[PDB]
Amino acid sequence: SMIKQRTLKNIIRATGVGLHSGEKVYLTLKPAPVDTGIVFCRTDLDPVVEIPARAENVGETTMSTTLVKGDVKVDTVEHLLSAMAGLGIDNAYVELSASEVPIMDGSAGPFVFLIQSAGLQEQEAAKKFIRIKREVSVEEGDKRAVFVPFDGFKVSFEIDFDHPVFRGRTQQASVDFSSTSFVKEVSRARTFGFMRDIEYLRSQNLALGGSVENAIVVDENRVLNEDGLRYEDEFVKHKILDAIGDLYLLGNSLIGEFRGFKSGHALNNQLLRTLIADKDAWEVVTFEDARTAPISYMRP
Numbered sequence: 088s089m090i091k092q093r094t095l096k097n098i099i100r101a102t103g104v105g106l107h108s109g110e111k112v113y114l115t116l117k118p119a120p121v122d123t124g125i126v127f128c129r130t131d132l133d134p135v136v137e138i139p140a141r142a143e144n145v146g147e148t149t150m151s152t153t154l155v156k157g158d159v160k161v162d163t164v165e166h167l168l169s170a171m172a173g174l175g176i177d178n179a180y181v182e183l184s185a186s187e188v189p190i191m192d193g194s195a196g197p198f199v200f201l202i203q204s205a206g207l208q209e210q211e212a213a214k215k216f217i218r219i220k221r222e223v224s225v226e227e228g229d230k231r232a233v234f235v236p237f238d239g240f241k242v243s244f245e246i247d248f249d250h251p252v253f254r255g256r257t258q259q260a261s262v263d264f265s266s267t268s269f270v271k272e273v274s275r276a277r278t279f280g281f282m283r284d285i286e287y288l289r290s291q292n293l294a295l296g297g298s299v300e301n302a303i304v305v306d307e308n309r310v311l312n313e314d315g316l317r318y319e320d321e322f323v324k325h326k327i328l329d330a331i332g333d334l335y336l337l338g339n340s341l342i343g344e345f346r347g348f349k350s351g352h353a354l355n356n357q358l359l360r361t362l363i364a365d366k367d368a369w370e371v372v373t374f375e376d377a378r379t380a381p382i383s384y385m386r387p
């Protein structure tokens with residue numbers, strides 16, 4: 088059959104705290120109709136404020152990706168959107184009782200488990216993909232983010248931290264997500280920060296909820312987390328996780344390759360905005376036969 092749009096089969100709930108705000112938040116994921124996309128909903132407000140998870144609604148990109156509408160924000164959407172992208176979820180309502188998505192364990196692991204526990208549901212409309220037709224890039228200083236054509240979906244990333252826990256380590260990685268490798272390869276890679284920064288961060292209303300329970304905390308000469316890493320390359324894998332979530336602000340799954348070099352949320356957003364304006368560089372495609380498509384998906 089054709090590759091169909093997907094939504095959630097049943098309502099999913101989670102409780103947590105925002106990484107940056109420290110505020111307790113109740114998360115509710117709900118099914119949504121065809122061509123809704125992912126829409127965030129601030130249900131603590133009356134009337135509610137609904138913000139589509141689209142590039143056009145990105146405000147700040149300092150230490151997270153923040154959606155904005157009116158005076159209202161939804162902060163730190165990248166890890167939940169990475170889970171949505173990784174599982175191929177087209178349509179969903181994401182209700183929040185506060186201004187930031189719960190950080191959970193710092194990865195997309197809890198989200199992919201909660202979603203897959205409930206299950207997905209295929210919808211009777213063709214899934215739409217954005218296919219990269221020619222190279223699109225943005226740079227700022229030594230940072231760079233690039234889309235190149237690729238028959239599938241692949242993400243590569245390189246970091247360069249002038250830090251003794253990073254020097255001499257694997258700071259580059261490439262993952263092919265044309266099959267069902269997202270869950271195994273990157274979903275559990277945790278966010279990370281530096282103990283040295285915590286006073287400055289907190290003064291900016293950042294990392295107020297951060298701890299070893301939801302982040303890899305890096306001290307001057309060692310990782311603070313006593314229990315160890317989930318992957319020897321967990322840092323660069325998390326950057327890949329972030330990129331997948333930020334890229335999903337395009338509103339559809341990508342057929343192409345992303346390469347990040349010391350990039351982050353700000354440059355990811357700039358890349359999407361120039362791609363969207365550069366219309367000859369991309370097209371929208373569907374697949375009436377899943378067997379002939381370049382990306383394959385798990386059963387719902």
Ligand SMILES: C[C@@](CCn1ccc(-c2ccc(OCc3ccccc3)cc2)cc1=O)(C(=O)NO)S(C)(=O)=O
Pocket residue numbers: 106150151152165166278279280281282284285288293294297298299302304325326329351
């Ligand atoms: C932007 C990033 C990273 C986001 N993040 C994550 C964690 C912390 C962060 C957490 C805890 C910290 O210290 C806790 C502490 C301090 C003293 C003693 C004990 C314990 C410091 C810092 C800060 C921060 O900004 C991203 O994942 N966005 O999606 S990233 C990886 O792309 O830089």
Ligand SMILES: [Cl-]
Pocket residue numbers: 230349350351352353354355
């Ligand atoms: Cl950046």
Ligand SMILES: [Zn+2]
Pocket residue numbers: 165166278325329
């Ligand atoms: Zn992250």
